[PDB]
Amino acid sequence: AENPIFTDVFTADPAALVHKGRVYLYAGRDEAPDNTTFFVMNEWLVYSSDDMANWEAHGPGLRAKDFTWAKGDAWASQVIERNGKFYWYVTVRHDDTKPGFAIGVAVGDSPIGPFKDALGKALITNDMTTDTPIDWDDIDPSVFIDDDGQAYLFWGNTRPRYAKLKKNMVELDGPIRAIEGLPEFTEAIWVHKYQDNYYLSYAMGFPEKIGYAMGKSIKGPWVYKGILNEVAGNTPTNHQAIIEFNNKHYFIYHTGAGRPDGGQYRRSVSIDELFYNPDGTIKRIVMTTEGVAPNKSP
Template identity: 55%
Template sequence: MDLSHTVKKSQDGLGRDITTDNCNNPIIRHKFTADPTAIVYRDTLYLYTGRDEAPEDQAKYVMNEWLCFSSQDLCTWTEHTNILKPVDFTWASGDAYASKVIQHEKKFLWYVAVTHRTIPGKAIGVAVSDNPDGPFTDAIGAALITNDMIGASPDSKDNLDPTVIIDDDGFGHMYWGNSQCYYARVKKSMTELDGPIHKIDLPGFTEGANIHRRNQWYYLSYGYGFPEKVAYVMSRKPEGPWEFKGILNEIPGNCMTNRPCMIEFKGRWYFIYHNGALPTGGSHRRSVCMDYLYYNEDDTIKRIIMTSEGVKAL
């Protein structure tokens, strides 16, 4: 694996943070990372990812933990250790799939997709912390969404890749799915659904939903087709109706999947995604990247240009 970045502070076995310098894509090089989500808190960007641990010759996802990195300049990244694992949910058996972190009042909530221990299929849980770099613990002691709630078959993987946004009225809105996109309103506690689960029919929807807001527009982006590009829809309301706006980025290099994250940081917008660009990388050994995101005058999004140079240090 490419370790060409500079290790400024090594881990000493006591779980202390590691700081690395890297201003090119992929932005994290000492571990395989995937499925990015991010928040901004106190002038710092916190990046959360899954960790790909599959052997080089194995075409199967092996994901046993989520990771957290933070940066104030988008070049120097600090890794925060021992953040969250699927087995931290007593009702889950494993699989650290795509997730979403939000800040809610004085808490930080982490919505994750895992395999349920007793209910067949994938499930969505929520963890909570007082700090953006954890540690996180199970917020409700049970799954928030399970296969039986959406009428899915026992072996279904429908409950993948949750994404959440809090509206001006304090209620949350959650989107997720695999082949079918689902939507549900969330109570102000952000740990309980507020009404029925609905289906959203989106062109080419595969997985990897992500919701963000700008200028009173809601943008729902997602993995489109397979191998996955990223497409998006727009709406004035979090519950829709949604208007399809087209493709945002093409199939990422050496990788069949795509999971976007859009975030504003220090006055600029960024597009975070993953590819298989590291040596020995691929669809099951992915790496998170970051490039610039630009809007048109009508608030639609310009096509994303994926680069090896990435973004400049702030």
Template identity: 55%
Template structure:
């Protein structure tokens, strides 16, 4: 009898671990655009939040969310500490964003839309929020947008300035990358809330949006959603310098289930590399009701990235 009880307990634990590890990793709300950050032996995951109904035919993204994990399997929900309403100048939805730490403060770079007013005709814009904690509360760091653009000639909102990604290089210089249709970058001052120098624009092969920039060993990586096909795939370039030139390396993630977009978030944690993305695999999910997944990421000896294998099982708990 005692043996059966122990066996039953082990089976329950095994089932529970499997359920926690399966993709998608968050099942109670729809989440998109993953942006991981490692801080003090914990992974903080910053996400978008899809609030569209099954009948909606466009995005409804009311806020950004934060989750944390010490093993990449069990995730704690920290709620929604930031939304476009945090920014007095903003309107519209909470699009892709990334949070980085510097000097004990947390800078959350976000893409949303700018109100049409005396300072702007509107359009996509990038703001920055700041907090003393990775889980907030966050506040507008500068009281205005960091990056703005204007309305297009056909009087529709321009989507040029979306999807920020930030790298703080080994010498302390910070860079902001972003952009739809073309990729842009600019230096950030040490305070992380002011830009320095001119905006640089370039066009990686098949680039459409969602850049994720990072450095591994002596190589810089620019990973992005590609316009080579619909639905999107993930492709990447590498460079010896953050300023380029960038060498195209190919496709690393094929189309995802039930979503015409995908979005990369990459992190090293406890000796392993992880690739985060979103798909529409949950029941009632879809292109406007997406969910974040995690799978392992592997490199070749020359630093190139192996193809990502998308799984339903996800990853095992990091030891």
């Protein structure tokens, strides 16, 4: 379970879920030939584990070009289960009909697919959010289903936003709302709940750290609580996912510590353990070479 956990490919922008006693881990595959130009990402890979230490590779689960309305760029994504189906929210570069990055959604009958575009068009297009002129604000989706059954889509670079999702998971319900209270917000929202607190962690500043805020409701208000993760080894992007599995908590992220020539466009998923303080704040992550111990259900 030494970090990075996969040595034969470069993996980035991790997301994870727990389904029938296995963790499923989703990540973009970095195919950039070096760290000199830009991200080259075409497909997302799927892995699974019953102990957080030994991982089964399932191969590509989805490709950016699977969305007929996308140019490419298999950017940050997240998968969630509802009512027996799996909804995969993706960042992709939209074709020129609606210039800029966008958020798509695919649907699958199992955690490993087969996945297909659930809409045949984008869920969020760049032109739906014009309070900033940049064309990469509509990236990095995070999805959450609250205890009352209301689902929510969070996203954004520069401008943090969320909206309710309909029960079908593929349609917005009501207004796109701006989120307040996240100082130095950059991108990469992850939302989770533990006991009676909600947590919104995010990439903060640039080069990126991870900051986080706590709320008593999924609607906020969000109260900033400080740095969750220092700048990650040899990468300016710091992209995280937090899950609870078998009575432990896991901070899944990426570094540029892989070989050969890991770096900003050739990243590697890593995992370390996450610990709560009694008051529900989170101890700052310690990023390690050793990673996590096996934690299989007895």
